[PDB]
Amino acid sequence: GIVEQCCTSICSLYQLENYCN
Amino acid sequence: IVEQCCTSICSLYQLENYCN
Amino acid sequence: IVEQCCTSICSLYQLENYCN
Amino acid sequence: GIVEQCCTSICSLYQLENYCN
Amino acid sequence: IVEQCCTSICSLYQLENYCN
Amino acid sequence: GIVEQCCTSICSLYQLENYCN
Amino acid sequence: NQHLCGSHLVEALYLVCGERGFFYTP
Amino acid sequence: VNQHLCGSHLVEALYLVCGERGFFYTP
Amino acid sequence: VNQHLCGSHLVEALYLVCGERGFFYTP
Amino acid sequence: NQHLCGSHLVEALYLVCGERGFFYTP
Amino acid sequence: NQHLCGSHLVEALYLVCGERGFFYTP
Amino acid sequence: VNQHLCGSHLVEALYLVCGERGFFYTP
Ligand SMILES: [Cl-]
Ligand SMILES: [Cl-]
Ligand SMILES: [Zn+2]
Ligand SMILES: [Zn+2]
Numbered sequence: 001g002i003v004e005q006c007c008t009s010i011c012s013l014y015q016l017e018n019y020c021n
Numbered sequence: 022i023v024e025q026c027c028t029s030i031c032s033l034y035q036l037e038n039y040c041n
Numbered sequence: 042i043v044e045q046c047c048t049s050i051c052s053l054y055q056l057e058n059y060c061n
Numbered sequence: 062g063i064v065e066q067c068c069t070s071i072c073s074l075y076q077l078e079n080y081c082n
Numbered sequence: 083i084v085e086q087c088c089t090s091i092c093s094l095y096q097l098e099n100y101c102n
Numbered sequence: 103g104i105v106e107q108c109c110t111s112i113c114s115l116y117q118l119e120n121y122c123n
Numbered sequence: 124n125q126h127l128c129g130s131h132l133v134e135a136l137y138l139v140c141g142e143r144g145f146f147y148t149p
Numbered sequence: 150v151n152q153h154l155c156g157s158h159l160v161e162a163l164y165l166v167c168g169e170r171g172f173f174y175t176p
Numbered sequence: 177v178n179q180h181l182c183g184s185h186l187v188e189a190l191y192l193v194c195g196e197r198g199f200f201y202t203p
Numbered sequence: 204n205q206h207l208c209g210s211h212l213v214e215a216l217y218l219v220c221g222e223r224g225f226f227y228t229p
Numbered sequence: 230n231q232h233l234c235g236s237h238l239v240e241a242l243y244l245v246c247g248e249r250g251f252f253y254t255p
Numbered sequence: 256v257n258q259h260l261c262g263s264h265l266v267e268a269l270y271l272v273c274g275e276r277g278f279f280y281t282p
Contacts, residue, residue: 002190003203007182010259013033013193013244016186020194021148023255027234030126033193033245036238039253040246041279043149047128050206053074053139053166056132059147060140061200063163064176068155071180074138074166077159081167082228084229088208091232094115094219094272097212100227101220102173104269105282109261112153115218115272118265122273123254127237131207133187137201138162147191148198151178151257154264158181160213164227171228174217178257185260189244211233218268239266243280253270254277 152176179203258282 002019005011022039025031042059045051063080066072083100086092104121107113129149136145156176163172183203190199209229216225235255242251262282269278 001203002186002201003179003183006186007179008256010256012247013189016189016193019190020197020199021146022238022253023231023235026238027124027231030124033241036241036245039242039251041250041252041281042132042147043125043129046132047125047204050204053135056135056139059136059145061144061146061202062176063159063174064152064156067159068152069177071177073141074162077162077166080163081170081172082226083212083227084205084209087212088205088230091230094215097215097219100216100225102175102224102226103282104265104280105258105262108265109258110150112150114221115268118268118272121269122276122278123252124234127207127233128204130188130191130237131210133191133201134161134184135165137184137187138165140201142203144200144202146198146200149196150261154261155177155181157214157217157264158184160217161210164210164213169229171226173224173226174213174220175224176222182256182260185263188240192241192244207233208230211236214267215271218271236267236270239270239280240263243263243266246280248282250279250281252277252279255275 133147160174187201213227239253266280
């Protein structure tokens with residue numbers, strides 16, 4: 001999950017753009 | 022930057038211009 | 042939501058409407 | 062204290078509304 | 083404070099007035 | 103570095119004013 | 124700007140909705 | 150140091166939650 | 177508790193990054 | 204909005220006042 | 230206010246630039 | 256990961272504190 005993914009390791013703007021609608 | 026991005030909303034692209 | 046809560050300030054109540 | 066209470070365990074909006082005037 | 087610092091930008095000095 | 107300095111120990115407003123131009 | 128409000132809007136939604144999560148659109 | 154960043158989000162929440170009622174912040 | 181402050185910065189980023197496209201937040 | 208400023212106001216007060224804490228009212 | 234935008238501007242720059250860092254001036 | 260959320264509050268402070276004087280951010 002977003003949290004699971006991005007609060008353990010630092011996510012790039014690119015990896016965040018995935019959770020967009 | 023203030024001039025650019027505070028009157029009209031700047032894209033991730035236009036901002037990236039301001040990186041060091 | 043922008044229409045609703047960016048012209049007049051929305052209460053915690055009105056926002057709660059926007060939860061998933 | 063607010064810090065003592067709410068920075069160790071996650072406080073609900075209800076538990077925060079207590080520190081209001 | 084809203085009156086003071088939301089019409090004209092307040093300095094670190096003017097804000098410090100509002101500390102408890 | 104700013105990070106090195108100020109993310110390990112809490113920096114005062116005065117110590118931050120140093121990284122200003 | 125209205126974009127600035129959106130930023131404050133989601134933070135709020137974030138605190139209000141919680142585990143329930145939420146959706147934002149413009 | 151964690152407590153300091155946390156305090157920052159505390160006052161932000163307190164702001165939304167308290168509103169017109171206002172609040173005092175003490176650590 | 178770390179995860180909660182983190183979530184806050186997540187949605188902020190998602191906001192900038194997603195933009196007009198919008199997004200859903202779930203923990 | 205003026206509400207948006209209040210949000211930025213407290214953050215500032217937060218950094219300026221510190222351990223001393225502070226008060227916010229509208 | 231325009232000062233409020235500056236606050237949102239740097240946060241953005243912060244997420245966009247990253248390790249590269251960035252500069253802000255008014 | 257802590258350092259990243261911290262950096263975010265750093266630049267925010269630097270913004271208030273530096274003001275017209277401005278600043279450069281480097282990690
Ligand atoms: Cl944080
Ligand atoms: Cl704003
Ligand atoms: Zn704002
Ligand atoms: Zn934070």
